[PDB]
Amino acid sequence: MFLTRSEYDRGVNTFSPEGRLFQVEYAIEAIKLGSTAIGIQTSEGVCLAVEKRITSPLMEPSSIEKIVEIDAHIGCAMSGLIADAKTLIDKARVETQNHWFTYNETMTVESVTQAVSNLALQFMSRPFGVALLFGGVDEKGPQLFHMDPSGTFVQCDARAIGSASEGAQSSLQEVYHKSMTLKEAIKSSLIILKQVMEEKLNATNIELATVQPGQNFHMFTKEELEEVIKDI
């Protein structure tokens, strides 16, 4: 008839009575501590946009954080911890480089997220404090994905992760439709990032990088962002 201080939540190996590894879900809270990253896969490509949360007008907005390229068609949008993002960007990038140096083919988006969940899921001695968002248009066609602390991946059509993961995924739930164009995805990602962001969306406080079947993964410029976020 006495209260006990039992801890299953200090150890990532230790199961609760219910069977919960809390440290993985505490690293999900660390994804939520990071910055919102909205990707929208379409019929005509997949877009990734993401907030930079630039704080000062002394820090350089010209520099590119929060979004990366991995080959021609695939990159991902990082959200949670940039230090932890880096080591999984490197996996993706080197193993798809190796795919092009083995088969002379660029590795499918599902297979790049397989490779990344081999470098993850390996606790690095802690549940990876980053969620990436792998948006490529491979051999098969457009594809968005989502990675999490647990290390695994899962396939997406419209996903928002990070600061307002569910704040901005409920906007995607209303906004995204199957027959989205890549133009639509671009503008919708951005305008929902705008209504999430406590700051006002200009091209300096956002990274967008988008791929189509035709036009391979590039990083949306100051001017391209400016144009879309003038309209939206």
Binding site: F15, S16, G19, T152, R159, Q169
Partner: protein, 238 residues
Amino acid sequence: MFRNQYDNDVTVWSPQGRIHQIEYAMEAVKQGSATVGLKSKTHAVLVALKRSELAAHQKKILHVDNHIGISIAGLTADARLLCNFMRQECLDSRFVFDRPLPVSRLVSLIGSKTQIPTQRYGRRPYGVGLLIAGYDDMGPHIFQTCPSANYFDCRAMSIGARSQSARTYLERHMSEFMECNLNELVKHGLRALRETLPAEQDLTTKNVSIGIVGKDLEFTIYDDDDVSPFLEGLEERP
């Protein structure tokens, strides 16, 4: 209350005489959703109750090799590890011996894979149960695995969340299954899956994957509206 001291390692016993962190892994099955698995003399069916519509596509049923696949109820890192291991076992059986791998044997390989962790420090029990449905020379198979390193042979089973409802259905119609068709056996599996569901909810070709192997049939994962034709015939929750 006293179990306190002895519950927080997998490589310590209690005065009571039981490792509680293996029992907690066997509670972590239930944190994942209700997979059903039931077989006949021709086919071995699986079904999976998939917990957004845009996000989290949730691939519960997984294909291992031509003759074999699984459905997943619990920790998904572990689900992946275990499935990928089985793919390698069967690859190697068809690389060296140029045959399928027995389902019994492959579930035994998973058994010993999942015992190492529990009898090792710096390790935890794979926190997931599988429903491992292949077809051999033998005939069709279902093989429940538990998050604990022990495992079962089954002709029907459900594991996951509020999954006793399904288990009960699968006992009531256990006999039917042995002598069912592909699609008959499937509707039986789906009615177990629907017994698990609230009465306000339904299958509605939405929270239905179906993972069927059989005699000439290979393990094929019907999803989205490839499950519609099976659910055409199923009728009357009553």
